């Protein structure tokens, strides 16, 4: 029960399950939102952003992952809501750009694509702040790169990404005072974990 190659339909499934899992957790993610203003909308913003990506994907499936990523990417970018939706759309724009000429990817390209998304999002945000979705995504990609170096299995890779992304998210209150004073982890980072956990379900052949 090992996934060594991700084609366009497996990536579509990861997108759909990631979106569904975020949707199911959107009210919780909204309730955590305090930075930079406590306006209760991170989960809705990222839910609607990922739904735009998911809708484009569902209507334009492909075996070729690079083509499927262009479709996903365009959907996010034309529906990005709020700080968190804009960052989410830029993380996956860089991820999808990195694979655009590929028909399927392996664990090392997957890890490199998370890293590529981190670089794109950090450059897109004019004044990046730590303790946020950027930090969680950055720590997830660094873990990806380290683990893919000795693992062909994308399921075991994604498991490890989630463990390290989760530790990063639990640390966000130590980087950003408002998170610590209110007593919450970063809502953007939590929304991103929801998507990553859907990715893992799909890699396992399961539904959310
Ligand atoms: N400068 C920044 N750098 C990194 N992340 C940010 C920044 N500003 C906002 N975020 C992310 O966005 C999340 C809030 O998203 P959202 O509620 O959609 O923003 P808003 O409602 O202010 O548009 C934060 O929890 C954090 O993860
Ligand atoms: Co639909
Ligand atoms: Co090639
Ligand atoms: Co092949
Ligand atoms: Co690089
Ligand atoms: Co800059
Ligand atoms: Mg908000
Ligand atoms: Mg808002």
Swiss-Prot record:
DhaL domain residues are: 9-201
- Source species, domain of life: Bacteria
Name the record gives this protein: Uncharacterized protein SA1069
Which part of the entire protein is covered? Answer: 1 to 207 of 548
């Amino acid at each position: 029960h090992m996934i060594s190659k991700i084609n366009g339909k497996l990536f579509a499934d990861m997108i759909i399950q990631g979106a569904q899992n975020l949707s199911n957790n959107a009210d919780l993610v909204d309730s955590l939102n305090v930075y930079p203003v406590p306006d209760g909308d991170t989960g809705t913003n990222m839910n609607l952003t990922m739904t735009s990506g998911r809708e484009e994907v569902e209507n334009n499936l492909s075996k070729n992952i690079g083509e499927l990523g262009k479709t996903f990417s365009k959907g996010l970018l034309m529906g990005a809501r709020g700080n968190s939706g804009v960052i989410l759309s830029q993380l996956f724009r860089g991820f999808c750009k990195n694979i655009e000429s590929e028909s399927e990817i392996n664990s090392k390209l997957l890890a490199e694509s998370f890293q590529a998304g981190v670089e794109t999002a950090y450059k897109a945000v004019m004044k990046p702040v730590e303790g946020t979705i950027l930090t969680v995504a950055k720590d997830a990609a660094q873990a990806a790169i380290e683990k893919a170096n000795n693992t062909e299995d994308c399921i075991e890779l994604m498991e490890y990404i989630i463990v390290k992304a989760n530790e990063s998210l639990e640390n966000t209150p130590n980087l950003l005072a408002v998170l610590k004073e209110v007593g919450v982890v970063d809502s953007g980072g939590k929304g991103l974990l929801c998507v990553y956990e859907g990715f893992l379900k799909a890699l396992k052949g399961e539904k959310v």
